[PDB]
Design a protein around this ligand. Structure first.
Ligand SMILES: COC1=C(OC)C(=O)C(C/C=C(\C)CC/C=C(\C)CC/C=C(\C)CC/C=C(\C)CC/C=C(\C)CC/C=C(\C)CC/C=C(\C)CC/C=C(/C)CC/C=C(\C)CCC=C(C)C)=C(C)C1=O
Ligand SMILES: CCCCCCCCCCCCCCCCCC(=O)OC[C@H](COP(=O)([O-])OCC[N+](C)(C)C)OC(=O)CCCCCCCCCCCCCCCCC
Ligand SMILES: CCCCCCCCCCCCCCCCCC(=O)OC[C@H](COP(=O)([O-])OCC[N+](C)(C)C)OC(=O)CCCCCCCCCCCCCCCCC
Ligand SMILES: CCCCCCCCCCCCCCCCCC(=O)OC[C@H](COP(=O)([O-])OCC[N+](C)(C)C)OC(=O)CCCCCCCCCCCCCCCCC
Ligand SMILES: CCCCCCCCCCCCCCCCCC(=O)OC[C@H](COP(=O)([O-])OCC[N+](C)(C)C)OC(=O)CCCCCCCCCCCCCCCCC
Ligand SMILES: CCCCCCCCCCCCCCCCC[C@@H](O)O[C@H](CO[C@H](O)CCCCCCCCCCCCCCC)COP(=O)(O)OCC[N+](C)(C)C
Ligand SMILES: CCCCCCCCCCCCCCCCC[C@@H](O)O[C@H](CO[C@H](O)CCCCCCCCCCCCCCC)COP(=O)(O)OCC[N+](C)(C)C
Ligand SMILES: CCCCCCCC/C=C/CCCCCCCC(=O)OC[C@H](COP(=O)(O)OCCN)OC(=O)CCCCCCC/C=C/CCCCCCCC
Ligand SMILES: CCCCCCCC/C=C\CCCCCCCC(=O)OC[C@H](COP(=O)(O)OCCN)OC(=O)CCCCCCC/C=C\CCCCCCCC
Ligand SMILES: CCCCCCCC/C=C\CCCCCCCC(=O)OC[C@H](COP(=O)(O)OCCN)OC(=O)CCCCCCC/C=C\CCCCCCCC
Ligand SMILES: CCCCCCCC/C=C\CCCCCCCC(=O)O[C@H](COC(=O)CCCCCCC/C=C/CCCCCCCC)COP(=O)(O)OCCN
Ligand SMILES: CN(C)C(=N)NC(=N)N
Ligand code: SF4
Ligand code: SF4
Ligand code: SF4
Lengths: 176, 70, 318, 115, 215, 156, 170, 96
């Protein structure tokens, strides 16, 4: 079905004509708009007091990346390159080799945060929950080179944010 | 809330008080504590000139009366 | 002592202009559900000072194609006339008591038009030229209507002296006498000061900053100060002309307080209108004044010529 | 005298503000910074080329009506005359002729901008 | 230019202020999305569709998902389809708020922009709760949707939808019967139905011309 | 020393005004400009901090490069940057301005606006949230606070 | 000489002080300026040249000009009215001493006046840009880059070949 | 009533520990609201809650005046919050 948005004709009785003439000569709808703006003036503003107040976020939020560890301290990443394969933006670079104890571990794990589109495919494709997109979003830098993270930086991020990362993954892992 | 607009309006009002009050005070200061004489016409100007002449101090606002006629 | 009086008239006006900028930002913020400046100082009280310092410590550039002499003169003319418009205003005592205080206002406003035209032309850019010509059309329409409305209302007064306006409004308000002329006068003052819905000389949506697109740093701040001083001065003139405060010769501070309160009310109404309405098209602005205001203005001028005669209420000449 | 002093004070203050603006800050000028502004691209033509005015007739009518209001301005003093009937007749005559001019132009389409 | 949406170069011939011709110059935001999509796979090409019309993001995602599912010969489940339709309508509300308020801002009104953008902020919160991204969700995918809704989302969407008609009413109080708005918008850019159909217009363009068509 | 103290106080005054009155140019290229609108919106009111959008580059202090810079747009971006009078700052917002972004390996895109203009702050994200952009603006303000132009000049 | 140089801008900014003061009217000074891009290219090639390790080069332009001819050409390219007048050396030194009291960057100094009056030496024994593989760019090809900024709007769009080259002293 | 509003303002003045504390919070936080103290971290940041305020403004933080080795009396970042209070403040959970 459909409806007409503008198809009505005004009534031509003398009362209606006088009302329209009064609206023309006395700016009734203009004063009505003034009243609406005044009502908003006396309402309460919706502004939060940043940086002392922060907007709501969810466990699913995708912010800065991090590399996680098992409770033993061992790295979760096994250098399987599934994140590198799935990355839409080709922002992950990975190189691996057997460790001194024979483990399958990475020697290079880079993420270009200026190429990353923060889509979260890498943490969907990770089979061991190693790479995650943490809750941090305030990490703007002063030089471009500081945004080209490497393995040491990502492990530092994981160590700094592990508590919150663990809590978010616990909250949201039953939807996955 | 909306009452945080008031201090700016208060400052602007305080700024707008200064010109008029200053003009009134300076008018009374330079005219012997009285209103500055309005001379919109030649008659009023001639009255001011005569007041200057009779004062003896070359100031129209120094008013003289019966103690001066006798 | 007169130089001290001139300074006492100038400096408070500039301070009021800065805090009018702050007040407009905060009023618009609260009408738009925001807060406006509240970080720079207590309730954003140092915001105008920060902006003024930034503008006058920034670099001003002269465009390679500009005519430098009239590029510089235009802000000087604008600010000088903005400061000059205040000298005949009685609050309750004018700095300069003129027999024809109203014609002086009209002449100085018509002169202050040319700052926009010369800044737009001397800038030598297409957007500046478009803003200048929008100013030409706007001045055409508002000028004719303003002159007729002032003639009628001052015809209810008896002369062109603003102190005589105070004496006339001793008992009631000219707005109670002549509210239709009051409405048309308010709209014409909006068009004259280039305020929304008539901010067409500097229309950000159509032109990138209009006539002062090429102005930077200090010379831009001078245009801003001139515009806001004109806003306050026109609201002060409207308050004196239509909302007459009571005057006590022995305590003139009461008139000053009443005058300031009425002026602030009208200025905040200007800000309210800017928040509330869209922008006109300048051809529609020309058609509004000529085809709607001018006929009613001429009819009301005839009515207000005839009314004192037919009722034997002709005001005294002095 | 006082008005001359006031005008001198205002002009001097504005000129001092311009002088401070153009001499206090650090200046760096080069041909790209001082180029004319046209939204990021170069202007095709010149800003000094003729710019058609679609309201050329309204401007001439404005000249004539401006001098009409110049005629009308001395009315407040004209109301103090003993010949009130003659004064009222001539005032209404001028206003009616102004209305007639407006009506003639409006009906003959002088108020419509050129296309 | 404020009214050029950032990357439009309109080369206009003006006689005074009358427009003699409009010569749009586009390509200032041409990236090569189609070439890149050729180089990506079907899952890797979905965010490209997120970033095409960055005001109706789940709508672009839905179009891509419908196409890929049609070629794959599969069917999304009913709950996935209902989530898709619900978020398509939420996205339509977001887009229409943006369109109307930006149009009014170009005309000269700004307070409706601010009010309806607070509403847009709440709908962004819904997006972020389902997806983790405020605008580029990448949530609707070929085969259904990526994840399921959290356990308060429907109640919060109900609250928002319950309180939104008043916002539309306040927006209409400032524009619909405003004589300045009507002078600016009435009899401007009139397009006939035959011209719309030949030129290939779709949506509100056709429906304003009077054509009874909706996909 | 007296002169050292005076120049320190003077540049503190000059830096305070510049950091407290920031006037970005209205310059948005792509989806990142919607998050800039939401920073302007009531929830994170930017005008509260003293940050006001101006249309003319001559009256702008900050350029927020928000969106993908293409080869057909790079001359225009450089032109408006040049027409900004000094002191002037650049904040590159989002992946497309920081580096290539999703469009890094493309024939039509400039891999970072820092190839065209000097960038002062880099805000990462696709798009950065309004809070992230606000954090970048405050970081820019703190960077302005550390400028010592008069202190360098006095010892120069 | 280049866009940000002192040389052409020093001579072209003297239009503010009425005429152009020249010592001996600039008839006793011979100068061959060099282009900034040639200088930088030579500096780069000296790094890459393995047989320039412990050497001394002289970077000079192709053409030698008298100072009067050079300044007259500068003003012709800038389209400014050239009104040169003689100024005795002691008076010019006094003027230069006046301008060097500036706390900021001075407009001119006494040593600047001495360097301007001094003729450029001829050192045929030292290697040069040709020896580093650089063909020196004549001033007549790059002067309009620097001096077009100093033109007025009346003359901004004038082309490069519109001004006849100055007389050289070779 | 205006009297109630003024009394609540005076309570806010007295709720921060004298006029000096009120001015300090006004100048370094631009707000003078008073809420219950949820807790305090090891760096000195204090965390307050007020459920009567609308969502978004019901939790806030007063940053410390010295974190690590930086004098943070005026320059306060949004990144000064440790991750647990970061989660609490951004409302990813209801449990402090
Ligand atoms: C490009 O796409 C995009 C869009 O699409 C275009 C968008 O929409 C958006 C989203 C953005 C929006 C929707 C923004 C739209 C919002 C609006 C249109 C409304 C917002 C409000 C404004 C724009 C208002 C702007 C106002 C401004 C900037 C004014 C600020 C300027 C000033 C304050 C400077 C002028 C004032 C001055 C110079 C003050 C001077 C005062 C003096 C000199 C007085 C002092 C005088 C003296 C003599 C000093 C001495 C005094 C003494 C000694 C007295 C002291 C004595 C004592 C006793 C104290 C985005 C992100 C986008 O990307
Ligand atoms: C010492 C000062 C030296 C510099 C002076 C510079 C003056 C420049 C303007 C000259 C013309 C105006 C003054 C004329 C002489 C005084 C007239 C007089 O006595 O008036 C009394 C009259 C008195 O008003 P009255 O009408 O009530 O007079 C009758 C009542 N009695 C007789 C009792 C006084 O003043 C006026 O009427 C005011 C009229 C002012 C008209 C000004 C016109 C020119 C405006 C130029 C604006 C320039 C702006 C700056 C531009 C800068 C650009 C870079
Ligand atoms: C079609 C409708 C036409 C309506 C026409 C009237 C529009 C009036 C618009 C008023 C705008 C005011 C803006 C500034 C506010 C300042 C506030 C302030 O200081 O107020 C204190 C001020 C007091 O300061 P005051 O001294 O200025 O007031 C008296 C001024 N005298 C006596 C010198 C004229 O006003 C009052 O308290 C009284 C105001 C009215 C004074 C006039 C006499 C009484 C008239 C009564 C009959 C009214 C009939 C119409 C009523 C209904 C109209 C719809
Ligand atoms: C509000 C309206 C009226 C406004 C009036 C003025 C408001 C501001 C007052 C404080 C200004 C403080 C000085 C800022 C100067 C500009 C900074 C600058 O260019 O720095 C870069 C330059 C850097 O120089 P440099 O030599 O290092 O740089 C060489 C060039 N580059 C950059 C290419 C390497 O600073 C200077 O040159 C310093 C000059 C001296 C600074 C102090 C002198 C002014 C003192 C002002 C006192 C107040 C009274 C006089 C002023 C007028 C008011 C009456
Ligand atoms: C023209 C106006 C006259 C009336 C003035 C009334 C008072 C004005 C009060 C406002 C002052 C505004 C300036 C504020 C900034 C303060 C710094 C300043 O002014 O710096 C200026 C300039 C600054 O040079 P600058 O151009 O490098 O400054 C840029 C600004 N800084 C660096 C501060 C950021 O200072 C000087 O010039 C002083 C150094 C010595 C110069 C000696 C010049 C000699 C005279 C000139 C002509 C010589 C040839 C004559 C030929 C014919 C002879 C017969
Ligand atoms: C009828 C009565 C006359 C009325 C006249 C009206 C004039 C109004 C003038 C403006 C008044 C309002 C502005 C001042 C309010 C804020 C003052 C104070 O709260 O601000 C403090 C700062 O004080 C300001 O400096 C006060 C400035 C007052 C002078 C400016 C107002 C007039 C503008 C033009 C002045 C020109 C002359 C220059 C005078 C210095 C900030 O506190 P804090 O966060 O802790 O700063 C610490 C930083 N430290 C540690 C480095 C110091
Ligand atoms: C309009 C006419 C003006 C004419 C010119 C007169 C100028 C009048 C002087 C104006 C002074 C304004 C003072 C500003 C007070 C600064 C407020 C305080 O907050 O600043 C702190 C200190 O700032 C600087 O350290 C000092 C700036 C002010 C001191 C300037 C020097 C003293 C001014 C006197 C002039 C100098 C002359 C000295 C002798 C030559 C830093 O705080 P900030 O980080 O931002 O706030 C962030 C917001 N938070 C808190 C919520 C996070
Ligand atoms: C005073 C006017 C007479 C002067 C005659 C001079 C020579 C003729 C040159 C023309 C000048 C006057 C032209 C005015 C009328 C021309 C316009 C016209 O034709 O129509 C008038 C137009 C009618 O509308 P439509 O034609 O239907 O168009 C609408 C279509 N939908 O409206 C009018 O009638 C306005 C006419 C003038 C308005 C003033 C009326 C004057 C009445 C007062 C009496 C004047 C007596 C003068 C002495 C005054 C003593 C107090
Ligand atoms: C004329 C009065 C003398 C003005 C000072 C000297 C004039 C001058 O050099 O121009 C300064 C400046 C523009 O200089 P630029 O052309 O942009 O290049 C030089 C930048 N400093 O112009 C001015 O400030 C004029 C001063 C106001 C004039 C007051 C007359 C009324
Ligand atoms: C006669 C009236 C004198 C005019 C007073 C000064 C007018 C303004 C002069 C001016 O503004 O320009 C001077 C100009 C500005 O340089 P910038 O282009 O800003 O370089 C900085 C690049 N970052 O300074 C100069 O470079 C000129 C230096 C050459 C000066 C030579 C000295 C000889 C002149 C004195 C002759 C008089 C003798 C009697
Ligand atoms: C006893 C006999 C007495 C004889 C006198 C009788 C007169 C009383 C009755 C007549 C009075 C009529 C009022 C006169 C003003 C009418 C102006 C007008 O023409 O109305 C509008 C024009 O006015 C406007 O449109 C206003 C646009 C700008 C509005 C933006 C600001 C207005 C909102 C602020 C309210 C202003 C309040 C004024 C306060 C004044 C304080 C001093 C008509 O134009 P259109 O609708 O476009 O159609 C005409 C062609 N079809
Ligand atoms: C730049 N963008 C994305 C806009 N929507 N711009 C606009 N002026 N409406
Ligand atoms: S979030 Fe997406 S673009 Fe970023 S590294 Fe992970 S897969 Fe690549
Ligand atoms: S998908 Fe996970 S385990 Fe595999 S290489 Fe990437 S981060 Fe390592
Ligand atoms: S970084 Fe992401 S959100 Fe920003 S312009 Fe590029 S694609 Fe759009």
């Amino acid at each position: 079905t459909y409806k007409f948005v503008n198809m009505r004709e005004p009534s031509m009785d003398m009362k209606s004509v006088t009302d329209r003439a009064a609206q023309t000569l006395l700016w009734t709808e203009l004063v009505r708009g003034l009243g609406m703006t005044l009502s908003y003036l006396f309402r309460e503003p919706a502004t939060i007091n940043y940086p002392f107040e922060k907007g709501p976020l969810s466990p699913r939020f995708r912010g800065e990346h991090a590399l996680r560890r098992y409770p033993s301290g061992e790295e979760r990443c096994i250098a399987c390159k599934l994140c590198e394969a799935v990355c839409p933006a080709q922002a992950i670079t990975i190189e691996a080799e057997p460790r001194a104890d024979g483990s399958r571990r990475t020697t290079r794990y880079d993420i270009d945060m200026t190429k990353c589109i923060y889509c979260g495919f890498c943490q969907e494709a990770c089979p061991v929950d190693a790479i995650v997109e943490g809750p941090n979003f305030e990490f703007s830098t002063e030089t471009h080179e500081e945004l080209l993270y490497n393995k040491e930086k990502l492990l530092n991020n994981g160590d700094k944010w592990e508590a919150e990362i663990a809590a978010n993954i616990q909250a949201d892992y039953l939807y996955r | 809330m909306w009452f945080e607009i008031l201090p700016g309006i208060a400052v602007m009002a305080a700024c707008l008080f200064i010109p008029g009050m200053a003009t009134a005070h300076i008018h009374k200061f330079t005219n012997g504590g009285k209103e500055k004489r309005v001379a919109h016409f030649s008659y009023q100007w001639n009255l001011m000139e005569r007041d200057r002449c009779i004062s003896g101090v070359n100031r129209y606002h120094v008013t003289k009366g019966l103690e001066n006629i006798d | 002592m007169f130089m001290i009086n001139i300074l006492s008239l100038i400096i408070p006006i500039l301070l009021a202009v800065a805090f009018l900028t702050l007040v407009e930002r905060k009023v618009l913020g609260y009408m738009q559900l925001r807060k406006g400046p509240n970080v720079v100082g207590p309730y954003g009280l140092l915001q105008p000072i920060a902006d003024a310092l930034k503008l006058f410590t920034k670099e001003p550039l002269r465009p390679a194609t500009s005519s430098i002499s009239m590029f510089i003169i235009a802000p000087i003319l604008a600010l000088s006339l903005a400061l000059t418009m205040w000298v005949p205003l009685p609050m309750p005592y004018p700095l300069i008591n003129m027999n024809l205080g109203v014609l002086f206002m009209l002449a100085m406003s018509s002169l202050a038009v040319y700052s926009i035209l010369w800044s737009g032309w001397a800038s030598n850019s297409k957007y500046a030229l478009i803003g200048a010509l929008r100013a030409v059309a706007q001045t055409i329409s508002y000028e004719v209507t303003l002159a007729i409305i002032l003639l009628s209302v001052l015809l209810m007064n008896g002369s062109y002296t603003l102190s005589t306006l105070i004496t006339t409004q001793e008992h009631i308000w000219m707005i109670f006498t002549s509210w239709p002329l009051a409405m048309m006068w308010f709209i014409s003052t909006l068009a004259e000061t280039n305020r929304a819905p008539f901010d067409l000389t500097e229309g950000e949506s159509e032109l990138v900053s209009g006539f002062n697109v090429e102005y930077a740093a200090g010379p831009f701040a001078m245009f801003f100060m001139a515009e806001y001083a004109n806003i306050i001065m026109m609201n002060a003139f409207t308050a004196i002309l239509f909302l007459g405060a009571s005057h006590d010769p022995h305590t003139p501070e009461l008139y000053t307080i009443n005058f300031v309160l009425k002026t602030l009310a009208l200025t905040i109404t200007f800000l309210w209108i800017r928040a509330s309405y869209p922008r006109f098209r300048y051809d529609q602005l020309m058609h509004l004044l000529w085809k709607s205001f001018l006929p009613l203005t001429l009819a009301l001028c005839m009515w207000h010529i005839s009314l004192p005669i037919m009722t034997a209420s002709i005001p005294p000449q002095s | 005298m006082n008005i001359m002093l006031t005008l001198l004070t205002n002009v001097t203050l504005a000129s001092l503000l311009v002088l401070i603006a153009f001499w206090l800050p650090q200046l760096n000028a080069y041909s790209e910074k001082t180029s004319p502004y046209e939204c990021g691209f170069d202007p095709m033509g010149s800003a000094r080329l003729p710019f058609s005015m679609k309201f050329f007739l309204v401007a001439i009518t404005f000249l004539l009506f401006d001098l009409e209001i110049a005629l009308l301005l001395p009315l407040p003093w004209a109301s103090q005359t003993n010949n009130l009937k003659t004064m009222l007749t001539m005032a209404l005559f001028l206003l009616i002729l102004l209305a007639a001019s407006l009506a003639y132009e409006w009906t003959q389409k002088g108020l419509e901008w050129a296309e | 230019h404020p009214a050029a949406h950032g990357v439009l170069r309109l080369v206009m011939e003006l006689s005074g202020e009358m427009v003699r011709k409009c010569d749009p110059h586009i390509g200032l935001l041409h990236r090569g999305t189609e070439k890149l999509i050729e180089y990506k796979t079907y899952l890797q090409a979905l965010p490209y569709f997120d970033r095409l019309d960055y005001v109706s993001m789940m709508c672009n995602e839905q179009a891509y998902s419908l196409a890929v599912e049609k070629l794959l010969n599969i069917q999304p489940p009913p709950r996935a389809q209902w989530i898709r339709v619900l978020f398509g309508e939420i996205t339509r509300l977001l887009n229409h708020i943006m369109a109307v308020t930006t149009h009014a801002l170009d005309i000269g009104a700004m307070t409706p922009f601010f009010w309806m953008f607070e509403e847009r902020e709440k709908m962004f919160e819904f997006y972020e709760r389902v997806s983790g991204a405020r605008m580029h969700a990448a949530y609707i995918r070929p085969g259904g949707v990526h994840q399921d809704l959290p356990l308060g989302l429907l109640d919060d969407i109900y609250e928002f939808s319950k309180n939104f008609s008043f916002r539309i009413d306040e927006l209409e109080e400032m524009l619909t019967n405003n004589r300045i708005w009507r002078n600016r918008t009435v009899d401007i850019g009139v397009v006939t139905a035959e011209d719309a159909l030949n030129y290939g217009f779709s949506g509100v363009m056709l429906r304003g011309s009077g054509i009874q068509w909706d996909l | 020393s007296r002169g050292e103290y005076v120049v320190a106080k003077l540049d503190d005054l000059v830096n305070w005004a510049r950091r407290s009155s920031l006037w970005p140019m209205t310059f948005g290229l792509a989806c990142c400009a919607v998050e800039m609108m939401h920073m302007a919106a009531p929830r994170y009111d930017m005008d509260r901090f003293g940050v006001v959008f101006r249309a003319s580059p001559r009256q702008s202090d900050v350029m927020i490069v928000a969106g993908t810079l293409t080869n057909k747009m790079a001359p225009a971006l450089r032109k408006v940057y040049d027409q900004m009078p000094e002191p002037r700052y650049v904040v590159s917002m989002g992946s497309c301005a920081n580096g290539g972004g999703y469009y890094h390996y493309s024939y039509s895109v400039v891999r970072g606006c820092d190839r065209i203009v000097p960038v002062d702050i880099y805000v990462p994200g696709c798009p950065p949230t309004a809070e992230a952009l606000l954090y970048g603006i405050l970081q820019l303000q703190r960077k302005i606070k550390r400028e010592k132009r008069l202190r360098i000049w006095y010892r120069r | 000489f280049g866009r940000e140089d002192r040389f052409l801008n020093y001579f072209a900014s003297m239009r503010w002080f009425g005429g152009v003061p020249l010592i001996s009217l600039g008839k006793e000074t011979v100068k061959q300026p060099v282009y900034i891009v040639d200088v930088s290219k030579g500096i780069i090639n000296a790094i890459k040249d393995p047989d320039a390790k412990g050497k001394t080069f002289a970077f000079v332009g192709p053409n030698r000009y008298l100072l009067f001819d050079l300044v007259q050409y500068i003003f012709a390219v800038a389209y400014r009215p050239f009104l040169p007048y003689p100024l005795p050396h002691f008076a010019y030194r006094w003027v230069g001493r006046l301008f060097e009291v500036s706390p900021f960057e001075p407009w001119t100094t006494r040593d600047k006046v001495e360097r301007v009056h001094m003729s450029d030496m001829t050192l045929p024994h030292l290697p040069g840009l040709e020896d580093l593989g650089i063909q020196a760019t004549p001033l007549e090809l790059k002067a309009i880059e620097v001096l077009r900024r100093h033109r007025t709007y009346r003359w901004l769009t004038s082309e490069m070949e519109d001004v006849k080259p100055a007389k050289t002293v070779n | 009533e205006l009297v109630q509003v003024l009394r609540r303002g005076l309570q806010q003045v007295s709720g921060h520990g004298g006029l000096r504390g009120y001015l300090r919070v006004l100048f370094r936080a631009n707000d003078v609201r008073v809420g219950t103290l949820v807790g305090e971290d090891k760096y000195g940041n204090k965390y307050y809650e007020d459920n009567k305020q609308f969502f978004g403004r019901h939790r806030w933080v007063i940053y410390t005046t010295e974190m690590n080795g930086r004098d943070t009396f005026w320059d306060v970042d949004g990144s000064m919050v440790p991750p647990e209070w970061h989660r609490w403040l951004h409302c990813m959970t209801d449990d402090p």
